[model samples]
Target chain A: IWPLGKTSEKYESAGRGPGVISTGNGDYGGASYGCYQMSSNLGVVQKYIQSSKFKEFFSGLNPATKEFNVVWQDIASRYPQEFREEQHQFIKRTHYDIQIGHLRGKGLLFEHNRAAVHDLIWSTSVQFGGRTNLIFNALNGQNMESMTDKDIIILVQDYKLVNTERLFKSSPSWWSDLKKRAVSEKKALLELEIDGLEVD
Target chain B: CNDTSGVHQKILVCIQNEIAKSETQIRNNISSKSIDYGFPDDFYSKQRLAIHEKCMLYINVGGQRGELLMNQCELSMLQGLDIYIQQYIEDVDNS
Candidate 1:
């Protein structure tokens, strides 16, 4: 049950750590940190810092200054351990918001203890950001209470094809990599013999 | 609407519907929170025009994938706006 969660954390980390600050490399400008892409995900970062306790961390920073790259790197440089811990918390919070909170709002429930189900949700959330709905939207109108692991496998397969064909018509190599990610998750679940594990 | 003349009729209708719904929701959200939050006065209208411009580009550049591309555009807009508003609301409450 728990190994899949750790596996997902490793998958999302992708060589980047909490203190890994990236700037001006990708399509998204400004600096980003952690596995969760904290810089581009401004709203998530803002929400994370909304607690009055941590609000002081960014007090002297200018909001308009390249997503507060200076202040963010300063914190990362000065308090590496604390930043790493917070980054882990941020990722967990975001994962829950998408997999649990967002799904519950839509009346879609999943068996978190089931390895495959958990991995699917985690991978979809990380891959699509807040657009996880694009994949789960396939399950609409079905009786989620009675959904099976096999059903989830089918959904994953369907999304791998549908999303790629529809959204990545121009990006052949990117689509190729995405399909591998889903297949790898499915293979891991089957190997653990928990694909059929009951929901908790 | 001018750039949409060459677009498929169905795609054009979807563009209008998505923009209309987004504008209404954004207006309601901004107006209710604007007085207390100090949101930029032009934030709502700016996003409105931004969505429209992007919708046009999606149609023009999407080629045969116009329908799916336009839908993606709408999805990105709503997702970004929804989170932005949620963060601001939470920030205000914490302050």
Candidate 2:
């Protein structure tokens, strides 16, 4: 039904033998977590969601039905194709080969109409230049905005706050501290960039 | 008097075994592609180039993220091979 074909087998097997890596919290490592098996990394994902207003908004959606819709709406509206092209360029510049597999396994295939909410979080975090933006904006007195209606709906569908937290946790130390500043300032730092400086 | 000929044959066999091992290493480095073990040099280059082009197109079309990652990994391996070949050619010239 998922059109996964043989690829599903690989996903399922990630919990088995050679795939058994240890997660500090015992939830993330193993084949059961499949191709994207970095559980420790997920801490950042959880933190990001909590920082966003997703928790409050999440209660309104039917958790099981509305996950994919949330991802499509957020990505389609905020970032646009220009964002995706930038990501492609980022890969070309960074030469991070392993991340490509991780992104794909997470369903980032172009034109697939099959994006997970987790993918949305990951892409956004990476697109915003991850920790660098987090720290830079915080130092400059950026505000942490509340979660968008779309964010709340998707977070509910995913059922795992871990993905969002992982993105946040991976931020640089300065950036992580900046988040504290943003919180105190009562502002959400979702898309904050320095004034007039394109990420390119 | 002819006993030394057997020693020469044994050395030849050892050389062949080493060649086989090197071939296996090359095969392991290539993740995809149906390589012809005994193909002519130009033919093999063409085949490899075709595979590279196909991979680039696939990445452009939103091919699986994992597959694109694999292709990048394979490309790095190929770059390493280029360096190795260059070193080997230099060694041959020096000798």
Candidate 3:
């Protein structure tokens, strides 16, 4: 009932509006200790719930129940949208092509509803200028999209860490299998990263 | 291929496999979408980005922590982190 219509699919695919994930990063947080999975989001929590309300309800309630859905609704309604078409765009382009989505909206281009909480993370996603901003447009006149895999080996293995000499004549099955193992939408992402290199 | 590339691929693939495995777990554990979601629909695509990102961070941490240790850096750090993994291996040889 979430995706709506023919696109109507699972709840997790689209997600409820304005919620916290246990695997959050940056302002979103990572350590899981709160009932709403939101203690670390102190600013965000206070924005939605008064400090007193959280003290009372969070301490005295069973948040996992359906009754809390009303609170969830309240929190979500506070930060509703036209259904993040932009969120999926990045996923389709960079990670998942076969899911076959309209994949609209620019991801992390601007601040989202909660800004820090909504559009910022380290492990899950990193914006262009955010922490873990390793992806780059182009540098030193190199068309990152054209960098060969060998270049990556040199960049990652030979350069950043050390000017180590090559030991193996070629990579293991894992090296070429990178594209197959990768989570791109259409073109192999490793190939893309090879050329579309983005480093911080 | 050299030792660095070999180790690089190992870490990279291990991360990818774990991410994919977690995807499978997410796919199985929850199919509800209205729950405000966790794994994005395009997780398959974005996972590549996340994996590379995390792996480099891991290596960076290794480099930084092991920076002052000696030329033999990652080994010591790997030993520190691998106690649990070593135990797990002791428990499951085939695995």
Candidate 4:
């Protein structure tokens, strides 16, 4: 397991270990599964169905017709390893790599440390959700090229902090949550080591 | 499910409805939840507004998944939300 991936996985775990399942209660997303809390509403299950190496597991099942809870429960029971593999691919290819390319396109060159910056923003996307244009929008008028890892992280955090307060009209519960998480992320970016970091 | 016909709008409607329902439920329960969740008296409307603003963080992946995936995502997420609502009501011993 990639150390960065494992670090973010702890935050996403929400105190539950791998193989945990949540039916998004008074919370966000539909039935989320596994360690990183992949959502059914986000179609993580269908992605698995379309690309599973064990095609026989999905035989005779119309992915559309099946409920996410039903689909995840069945598949996760039989193929935990595949679940982890697919989750790895999903986070790396779909989230982490995408953000890396996106930052480069915006001229945010990572000359100092690649993995640290990559994992910080990647985990931010994972914690917030993939289509958070907030992260991109926050960086909109900035000098992307010369920005340090600290600059990028603080910019994102301050932007999110302001916007989140705007939404809630006060110091909200998740504000502290994200702030603490950002501190850990910044420390990780500096040390260039994400292994075994305690979840904030 | 292959047909793309207005699927995007349909998903938006689902999200809006869920947010509205949660807001109304919270509003209706403000008296008790003020004690349960432990917040000040004026926090109800702010909390409700936060729901509308932040729902996008969860429901924003609209166009990426096909209709099949979209339906399941909506179904499962709503199901989970409903379960939580039930649990909260149970906590207060209210029907």
Q: What C-alpha lDDT do the candidate models reach, one value each?
A: 0.55, 0.31, 0.28, 0.52
* lDDT: the better of candidates 2 and 4: 4
RMSD of each: 15.1, 23.7, 17.9, 13.0
Candidate DockQ scores, in order = 0.02, 0.01, 0.03, 0.05
How well is each residue in A125-167 modelled by candidate 4, as lDDT tens digits?
5544444455677778887667666676667766655665453
Off by over 4 Å in 2: A1-200, B1-40, B43-64
lDDT by residue (tens digit), candidate 3, B1-95: 22222222223224334434444444443344334434456653354344334333332322111111211222222233335334543455454
Q: On residues A1-200, what C-alpha lDDT tens digit does candidate 3 reach at each position?
A: 11111111121132323443233222112221222222221232332333333344443433333444454445444543421333333332322221111112212221222111111122112111122222221112454467544343233222212211121112233333222211221122223333433321
| 2 versus 4: better DockQ goes to | 4
lDDT of 2 at A122: 32
Per-residue alpha-carbon lDDT of candidate 1 for residues A92-133, written as tens digits (9 for 90 to 100): 556544566677777776635776566566555554553356
The regions of model 4 sitting more than 4 angstroms off are: A14-18, A24-30, A54-56, A59-78, A111-113, A129-145, A167-173, A191-200, B1-58, B61-95
Candidate 1 lDDT tens digits, B1-95: 33332222223243435545655666778888747688788887787567646654643331223433544465557657867887888988998
* lDDT accuracy of residue A77 in candidate 4: 76
Per prediction, the TM-score for chain B is 0.62, 0.35, 0.29, 0.40
Question: How many residue pairs in model 2 have overlapping backbones?
Answer: 27
Q: How would the docking of model 3 be graded?
A: incorrect
Model 4 chain B worst lDDT window (10 residues): B1-10
Order the candidate numbers by lDDT, best to worst. Answer: 1, 4, 2, 3
Query: TM-score of model 1 relative to the true fold?
Result: 0.54
Model 3 lDDT, residue A79, Cα: 41
lDDT of 3: 0.28
Clashes (N, CA, C under 3 Å) per candidate: 0, 27, 34, 3
TM-score of every candidate: 0.54, 0.21, 0.24, 0.53
Q: Which predicted model would earn the best DockQ?
A: 4
